[PDB]
Amino acid sequence: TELKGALIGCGFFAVNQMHAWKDVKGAGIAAICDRDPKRLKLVGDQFGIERRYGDAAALFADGGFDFVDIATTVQSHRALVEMAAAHKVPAICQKPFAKSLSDAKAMVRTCENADIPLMVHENFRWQTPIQAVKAVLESGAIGEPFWGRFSFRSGFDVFSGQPYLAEGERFIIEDLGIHTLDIARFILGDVATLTARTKRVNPKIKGEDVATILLDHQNGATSIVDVSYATKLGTEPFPETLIDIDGTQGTIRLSQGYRLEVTGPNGMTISDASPQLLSWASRPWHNIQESVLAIQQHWTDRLSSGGETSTSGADNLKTFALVEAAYESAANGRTVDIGAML
Amino acid sequence: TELKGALIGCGFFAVNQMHAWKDVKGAGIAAICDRDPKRLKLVGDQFGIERRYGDAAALFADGGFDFVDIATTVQSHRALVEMAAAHKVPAICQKPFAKSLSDAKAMVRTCENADIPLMVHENFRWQTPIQAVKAVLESGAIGEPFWGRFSFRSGFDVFSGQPYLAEGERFIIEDLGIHTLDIARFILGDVATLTARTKRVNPKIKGEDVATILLDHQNGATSIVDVSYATKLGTEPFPETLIDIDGTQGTIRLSQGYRLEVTGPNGMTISDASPQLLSWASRPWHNIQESVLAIQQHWTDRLSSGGETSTSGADNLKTFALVEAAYESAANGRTVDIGAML
Ligand SMILES: NC(=O)c1ccc[n+]([C@@H]2O[C@H](COP(=O)([O-])OP(=O)(O)OC[C@H]3O[C@@H](n4cnc5c(N)ncnc54)[C@H](O)[C@@H]3O)[C@@H](O)[C@H]2O)c1
Ligand SMILES: NC(=O)c1ccc[n+]([C@@H]2O[C@H](COP(=O)([O-])OP(=O)(O)OC[C@H]3O[C@@H](n4cnc5c(N)ncnc54)[C@H](O)[C@@H]3O)[C@@H](O)[C@H]2O)c1
Ligand SMILES: C[C@](O)(CO)C(=O)O
Ligand SMILES: C[C@](O)(CO)C(=O)O
Ligand SMILES: [Mg+2]
Numbered sequence A, B: 001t002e003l004k005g006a007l008i009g010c011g012f013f014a015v016n017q018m019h020a021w022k023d024v025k026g027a028g029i030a031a032i033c034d035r036d037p038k039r040l041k042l043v044g045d046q047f048g049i050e051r052r053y054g055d056a057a058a059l060f061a062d063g064g065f066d067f068v069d070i071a072t073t074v075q076s077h078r079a080l081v082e083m084a085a086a087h088k089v090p091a092i093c094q095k096p097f098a099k100s101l102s103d104a105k106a107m108v109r110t111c112e113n114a115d116i117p118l119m120v121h122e123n124f125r126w127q128t129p130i131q132a133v134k135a136v137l138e139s140g141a142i143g144e145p146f147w148g149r150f151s152f153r154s155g156f157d158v159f160s161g162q163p164y165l166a167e168g169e170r171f172i173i174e175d176l177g178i179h180t181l182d183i184a185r186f187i188l189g190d191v192a193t194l195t196a197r198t199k200r201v202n203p204k205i206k207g208e209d210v211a212t213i214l215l216d217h218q219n220g221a222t223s224i225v226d227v228s229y230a231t232k233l234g235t236e237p238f239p240e241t242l243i244d245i246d247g248t249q250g251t252i253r254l255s256q257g258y259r260l261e262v263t264g265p266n267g268m269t270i271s272d273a274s275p276q277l278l279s280w281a282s283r284p285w286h287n288i289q290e291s292v293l294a295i296q297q298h299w300t301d302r303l304s305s306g307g308e309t310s311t312s313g314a315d316n317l318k319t320f321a322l323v324e325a326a327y328e329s330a331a332n333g334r335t336v337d338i339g340a341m342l
């Protein structure tokens, strides 16, 4: 009955994906793969996976799975997606999708030629509060949107769980802004032009931890995407994205604690848009953790019905172009044309 | 000794300036001037002013005053400042200072040549909550500021009291953004480069009612100035400017209802930064109305002691440049160098 998955990269975040695969209806994990045998045993023993591999090439050679879930760091994404396409195995790939837009496009083209689905595991838009904002806007409750702010400002120690974040020359846009830019696209549509500024505040890291981005959307809306991992607040908001939308007939204000305020022609409503806390989830990650179940169930449903996923490889190019444009803009000082990159 | 003022432009907003001049210690109004004799009659009778002039030329010829308060619309500012300079009368001039940066510079030059003070009545930085943000940041409570947001988003019918606002090709940056940009300078210092976007949402007006501006400050800080008169919120925030500042050791958050959250190395504090309610004030103008008294007392103190004012003509050029740069940037789509304009 169930689709049989193979997960590659049994790291920090993969533990969440494994829990979710148990919960997903119509799919489960039949095999795992990791370069590190300490991680291979730890995850293998925790989830009771009999089939365990030290390298992906051997995994693919044995086969016996219907899809692959790639939860490695960015360095091995291109090779693993290319291995999947050559073996005709539908593939999920973690963010950041690739090291460059050029690599991403090549990965998309290879999967399109192999006639296999490719979904980027881009789960921020699958969060309950973000879904709620989308539903309000699509309902026409505030009319046509003309302005947005999408803000993730945190002082959370992401570096403990994910030490590589402190080492790269590139940090926040590639790691976190990739989500916030995707949310901006999800809510207000594709971007025409982009302008960005960056800064490093934290002395203990190599790369930028503050980014401010100004988006000119194709539909005429303007938005601000502002991200920071050097923001010291009284109440730590991690991992909440706060959202303001202004429209011709109203406003949406998603504020701290998942408070969703909507003003329209017929007054003003307030609702709790907080996530469900799953049995295996853990504060403060529970928002992200629920969205892992949401996107993996989405993948599983779309693989059966044969439709395109929401954050497909093809879709995600238009998010990834913004990340690369933001770095270009921050260095050059100039506004970047997004259409010309694609 | 009591300083004697002449006020020119007995319009909508000048009634507030007249109330405030009564409350000011060390100064009062001895003469008024307006081309419209209905306004001259109404304001003259209300405030008991015997000396009433149909034109400024005659007012200056008769003299008998130590300073002039110009509360007309922008069209007549340059001429009235020039008349003040030639008659060696210290001058206050309402915003917008001039029609262009070029006119503003000439006005500043003429007053410097005549050895008379020139202050722009730029009263937003003189609001109690804005003064509190400045005082917190100057104290060192949050370390060195690196990022800010300054936001004035409203659905208030400013067009009732000020109908001309609906008629101009230019609207919100010139009318309101001029204040918000001044606050950005006041808090985070002078600006090196600037990028702006504008649009018109309201179908009943000629000019732009939404503007979003990205500032690169000379000290390294980045800020967003976002203004709108087409924002429909459950609670109308007019005329509050909301302010976020991030620093190396903390944050300032000035939110709706004048609530001031400051978090630093010691902990979080919440303060009530609400304005006073003067005897002659009216909701919802009371915050602005208090600041009119503050700036007019400031003028009076500085004129009496021979100091320079905070929003002197010379200082205000660095605000006004940002307004002209924002219009330029919004039309061309290009980043504008502020230094090159001054
Ligand atoms: N919200 C989210 O969706 C979210 C949250 C955190 C991290 N992430 C992303 O997930 C990815 C993984 O992050 P992480 O913190 O778990 O990394 P990690 O370093 O903890 O784990 C990666 C694992 O993959 C293994 N690996 C690397 N290359 C391999 C290869 N070629 N074959 C087999 N195994 C290989 C490593 O041994 C390691 O155990 C990153 O790209 C990150 O951006 C996403
Ligand atoms: N926060 C603030 O400080 C604030 C608030 C509102 C308005 N304003 C500014 O105040 C100015 C006036 O606004 P308003 O709404 O009172 O305008 P208004 O049209 O109501 O008043 C202007 C008055 O000046 C008179 N006038 C014009 N040219 C003249 C001349 N050459 N000689 C004599 N009289 C002349 C007109 O007859 C009119 O009565 C504007 O520049 C506006 O931007 C500032
Ligand atoms: C945790 C993070 O890597 C962003 O910092 C994520 O993708 O959720
Ligand atoms: C009212 C206003 O003109 C801004 O819209 C002012 O200057 O206070
Ligand atoms: Mg399952």
Ligand SMILES: [Mg+2]
Binding pocket: B021, B022, B023, B024, B025, B026, B027, B028
């Ligand atoms: Mg007085």
